[PDB]
């Protein structure tokens, strides 16, 4: 050992990452004639916790009856789900959100339902994710979307007012345009322009507003407005196969999963 | 043809960081010898990185009680803070270096009279207790404490941090928490002692230094 | 963008008087690739050093800064100085540093006569966070989000000594230049002039 | 030598273009028990200029953890960024602006935020340039875009009024023919119609509005208009991997970084 | 035959120094792995015993005046007690550790006008100058200052002391004496600069460490 | 070298303990028609103080014509005091 902390017995490794893939299949009997060993054991020394868990004389259960597999977060999470939404009062209201992994944020204002129990089961984060926006409304609008990374000048969070930012600083960072009237959907990555190295979303104190952010869609609108029509637009989340998980947390309970 | 030689005027000598290039120089001139002690007057190994950081460090002591109801949080602690104090000799290597990269070694010991029962644990937190479940702690690597058998776990745990170095003048967060819940209530009869001893032992592994400051 | 940074620019001016005490702080520099503070007023011009402009079109830097201090004595002047490297942020209570306390941390010294003006000395990586942040885009202070990783103090190490048929001062400029720079996720930002 | 000019030393080769490429990567110690030689020198000689620059033994940082690179001008200017933009007034108000090079021209009359800075860095350029325009605003308005290079007649610059140039000038040069309603923005490159060398950003004198401008992008509307409302066009630039680079120049003082 | 092994009672674990053995233990559990960081956010080598201990330290600034009479006595100082002050990184490994054993290198720099002109003397002398000669003052190893030639020397002497290991509590005499005496009067005439600086950097060499203390 | 303290010169021995042993012994010309090197030197270096000391073109002086020796202390303190 490096450090020089000898013992008298030997620490095995503890709680090992993805013990088992869930498909029930094959990969005579589990349990029978040989005799149970563990079925009694000792729970607080981690090395006889070790133990392969049985009571009953078993067989195998057999092979799965679906094709695809849910079990894996690259195709549990893969179906999007709800972010926030926000609509328009007046001609070219730049709407700005950020994303914030906290739990500490309650919805609408911060994490709805099932990105608030998934963005805290595990501690940090490092990664892109898929961004897949909705309008829906009034006809013949103008409008254009871009990124924004953090510890920049921006507009205010969660607020719909005037821009004050420009041509210039919105076009020089990356940006689409498009029309209402076209296509209506915009299907786009979030790439992970930090300079951090990883983000973290349960926290508290001053490093929950600071160490957990990592990306910033923001929105403009023009050639508002026409005849009297809502113009509310959506924004879902997935996760991407480029993005990675660590240190396994314990669940959100029972008082914090919410919806908006 | 003869050529007599002079003084070389630049040199570039010094220490490992403290760096000095002279315009007038002259040779270092040297006597003697580093002389080793054959009858040795200091049996064990001379102080060292490797000995000095990495010991084990009584960091708080507290005394988990009877009356205690049950998941009633023993111990709230920063593990990284308390070894930063006067008191230590890991406050030595690190007054003069800022940036800090560890691994946290913990092992705690309690001691039970056996006319008593109960049980505590012992789970290590990253960040904070914000949200996480009291009943789903053992996902953390964590180690039971038990009136029947055992008073003696460990648990090794790495550096899990949102960034690489750590400041230690203006921290954003708590690297890792130390918690210690009552698992079962402590119960006695009559005549039994009313109280049972805690104790924390931490030490640091892996450690690396990263430029150093004037400044304390 | 390699051919603008590594090339020596001026970012400031001290000079070196005689009239001081030993150990006085001269002038204190936040080590950064933002840094400028010259001028002109003929024409009305702010000079800018090569290295500033192109990192200030990026969220983010790394990498080492490479400091070049060059003198113009007379070949009878004399004295030294000491180029330490106190790291940190840039906002701190710098200017209570003892000398002897200024002997832990890294540093170079240097003599003032010679034949060899330019003392190059490197700026090591010394940071808590691998991502250094343009924090100059916003205009409220934040912990955690920094743009120095070290701060430079010359000290009068010695005084200076001089024959009387010259002056009492020796100039010393500041170059700037970097090597092994890396800077990532663009943006626009006009940086302001530094007037420590 | 060619010249017969002789000298007593050798003259060697200075300030060698593009010395290392930015990634942080490994292409033991750097500086350690071998003595720093670069830590003092001479900067007055070149020759001695060139020693490498150490002054505490170290070693390598190590490799860089993101996939892209972003420290050659192939990658950082592909970004687009802001060039013009304007309005319309009335019923087939042509609009045309040229692209200058010039420093001297202050925007909007000019180059804006990024392109001033990024077009005074270098001496001469010789190569095409990416042009996206955006169309938003009003419905069921007609239009056409075409090019006319340098040393034509061409109606005047930055001024919206009537064109005195008629179908037969406008399309024999080239030219394109779309609608505002079906997709509403173009994609166009800007190619290199030059009968001189290379343009140059830098210039003063009459030799400023003759030796720097390559192009000229200009637009003409039609079926205009229909119930109030605006119609404004947008122009960015973006450079192309069929340019060059010529002689590192000095980069703007802070007195010349403006935006729109 | 199955058998259930169980925890072992003894271990002896622990730091270099600090030793502890358990009759109650457990076993020590490990997860993950000390990370090394390749893109490097430090290039130069972690702070150790080499590079810090090692390095030249400032000690005295005096000034080397014009109306010194002959044989005066410039500087008279303890090296190795002007290294032990709060000031300096070498503070951080002599605090905890009380015995020492290092040897002494010397850089001595002045920066006289060539429009004077003198000379100095810089011995090392071990225990005091009790009855030494000032005219036979080579003997030791000393180096000369002149105005003519050069201005930069060094001297590398051994640990010259009637023992081995050094206290620092209550030392029985200096281990070492750096005198700085006036070999030639330093004349000017008009308008030459009255004052010339003087500068001594010292540093250890080979030091050891044994028996730490708990003690400041 | 263990501490790292680098420099530009060399730093060669100095004060090299019992250089002679005093006998006038044996162990042609000293100086002569070579030419004396160490007639003129630098004293502030020690590396060129290290030079043989010469003036005049010289011989041996010869075998000394006692059979003890009387310069080293195991022989000089003896008598004693």
């Keep these: ?260 | 043809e003869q050529m007599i030689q002079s003084v070389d005027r630049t040199a570039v000598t010094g220490a490992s960081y403290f760096t000095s290039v002279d315009q007038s120089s002259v040779h270092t001139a040297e006597v003697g010898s580093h002389q080793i002690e054959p009858l040795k007057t200091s049996v064990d190994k001379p102080g060292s990185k490797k000995t000095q950081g990495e010991k084990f460090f009584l960091i708080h002591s507290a005394r988990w009680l009877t009356t205690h109801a049950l998941f009633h949080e023993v111990a709230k602690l920063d593990v990284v803070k308390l070894l930063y104090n006067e008191q230590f000799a890991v406050q030595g290597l690190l007054r003069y270096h800022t940036y800090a990269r560890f691994g946290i070694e913990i092992q705690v010991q309690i001691n039970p009279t056996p006319f008593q029962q109960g049980g505590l644990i012992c789970a290590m937190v990253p960040g904070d207790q914000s949200y996480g479940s009291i009943a789903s702690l053992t996902v953390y690597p964590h180690g039971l404490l038990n009136c029947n058998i055992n008073n003696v776990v460990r648990i090794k745990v790495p550096f899990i941090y949102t960034r690489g170095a750590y400041h230690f003048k203006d921290p954003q967060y708590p690297v890792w928490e130390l918690t210690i819940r009552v698992w079962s209530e402590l119960n006695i009869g009559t005549g039994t002692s009313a109280y049972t001893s805690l104790n924390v032992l931490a030490r640091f592994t892996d450690l690396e230094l990263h430029g150093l400051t004037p400044l304390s | 963008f390699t051919t603008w940074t590594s090339i020596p620019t001026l970012a400031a001016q001290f000079p070196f008087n005689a009239s001081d005490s030993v150990g006085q702080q001269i002038k204190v520099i936040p080590v950064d690739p933002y840094f400028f503070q010259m001028t002109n007023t003929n024409p009305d011009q702010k000079c800018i050093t090569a290295l500033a402009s192109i990192c200030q079109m990026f969220c983010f830097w790394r990498g080492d800064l490479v400091f070049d201090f060059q003198v113009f004595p007379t070949k009878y002047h004399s004295g030294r100085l000491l180029f330490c490297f106190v790291p940190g942020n840039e906002l701190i209570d710098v200017t209570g540093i003892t000398l002897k306390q200024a002997t832990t941390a890294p540093c170079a010294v240097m003599d003032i006569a010679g034949v060899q003006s330019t003392l190059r000395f490197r700026v090591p990586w010394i940071s808590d966070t691998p991502y250094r942040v343009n924090r100059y885009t916003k205009e409220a202070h934040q912990k955690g989000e920094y743009t120095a990783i070290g701060k430079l103090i010359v000290y009068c190490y010695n005084r200076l000594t001089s024959p009387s048929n010259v002056a009492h001062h020796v100039r010393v400029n500041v170059y700037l230049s970097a090597i092994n720079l890396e800077c990532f996720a663009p943006l626009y930002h006009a940086m302001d002039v530094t007037t420590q």
């Design chain 1, 1 to 260: 050992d490096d450090s020089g902390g000898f013992s008298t017995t030997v620490s095995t490794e503890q709680n090992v990452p993805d013990p088992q893939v869930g498909i029930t299949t094959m990969r005579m009997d589990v349990s029978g004639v040989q005799a149970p060993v563990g079925a009694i054991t000792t729970i607080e020394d981690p090395v006889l916790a070790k133990k392969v868990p049985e009571t009953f004389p078993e067989l195998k259960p057999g092979e799965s009856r679906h094709t695809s597999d849910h079990m894996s977060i690259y195709k549990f999470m893969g179906r999007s789900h709800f972010l926030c939404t926000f609509t328009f009062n007046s001609n070219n209201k730049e709407y700005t959100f950020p994303i914030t992994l906290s739990s500490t944020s309650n919805p609408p204002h911060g994490l709805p339902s099932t990105l608030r129990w998934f963005f805290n089961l595990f501690q940090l984060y490092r990664g892109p994710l898929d961004l897949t926006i909705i309008i829906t409304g009034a006809t013949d609008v103008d409008g254009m979307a871009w990124f924004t990374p953090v510890g920049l000048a921006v507009d205010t969070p969660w607020v719909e007012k005037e821009s004050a930012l420009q041509i210039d600083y919105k076009t020089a960072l990356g940006a689409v345009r498009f029309n209402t009237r076209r296509t209506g959907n915009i299907q786009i990555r979030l790439p992970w322009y930090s300079y951090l190295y990883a983000v973290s979303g349960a926290l508290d104190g001053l490093g929950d507003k600071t160490d957990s952010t990592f990306g910033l869609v923001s929105i403009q609108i023009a050639n508002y407005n026409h005849s009297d029509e809502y113009l509310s637009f959506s924004c879902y989340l997935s996760v991407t196969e480029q993005s990675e998980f660590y240190f396994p947390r314990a669940p959100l309970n029972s008082n914090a999963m919410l919806s908006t």
